[PDB]
Amino acid sequence: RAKAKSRSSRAGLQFPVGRVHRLLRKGNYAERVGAGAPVYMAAVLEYLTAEILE
DNA sequence: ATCCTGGAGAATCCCGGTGCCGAGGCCGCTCAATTGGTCGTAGACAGCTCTAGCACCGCTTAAACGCACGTACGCGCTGTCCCCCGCGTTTTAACCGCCAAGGGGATTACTCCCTAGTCTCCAGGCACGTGTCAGATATATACATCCTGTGAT
Q1: Among A26, A25, A27, A48, which residue's Cα sits nearest to residue A37?
Q2: What number of CA atoms fall less than 13 Å from residue A51's CA on the CB side?
Q3: Strand B nucleotides where any atom sits below 7 Å of a protein CB
């Protein structure tokens, strides 16, 4: 049994990834969401967040 | 009428202290993320067809290009006038803090029933084919609108 590990850490991100994946698959955006979509998106939201805050 | 200091008079910035309540860090806990395995089908891939988008040619001709004339428009200048602005005094009700009441939003537990998912069967709707009528084209005639002269007022 591997230890549970936050994806944000894995991706080197501060924004949550599992949650983004979760949001993407529902809200009825699509029947299915690919593994790399949540990750790509989390990076984008984080990037923009940084620009405004900076 | 317009430029140049120099002062007076507010208004706005900076300085230092009060004090408060909103941010920031800590603890419990709970339920949403993670893991791990199974199933099946959406998407990747290769192959093939053949539509339709590119390139080229020559001819016809309606649009585009450039020029010359002249005048309606844009622009600047002047003067009137009147209607906003800025100030001061009076009047209003917005805001604040406190209180009480209760209406309606939020959560809980439970149960159907109203939908998704399945299979079967047939007729409603799309791709193709064919015929002819509506609208486009072109001809020619007649009516309506526009712009100088021309007399009347």
Answers
A1: A25
A2: 6
A3: 32-36, 42-43
Nucleotide nearest to A5 (CA to C1'): B34
CA-based diameter of chain A, in Å?
41
Which technique was used to obtain these atomic coordinates? cryo-EM
Residues 6+ apart with CB under 8 A from A43: A11, A13, A15
In Å, what resolution does this model reach? 4.1
| Residue A2 CA to its chain's centroid (Å) | 21
The conformation of residue A27, written as its DSSP 8-state character, comes to: S
Cα torsion through A30, A32, A39, A42, rounded to 10: 30
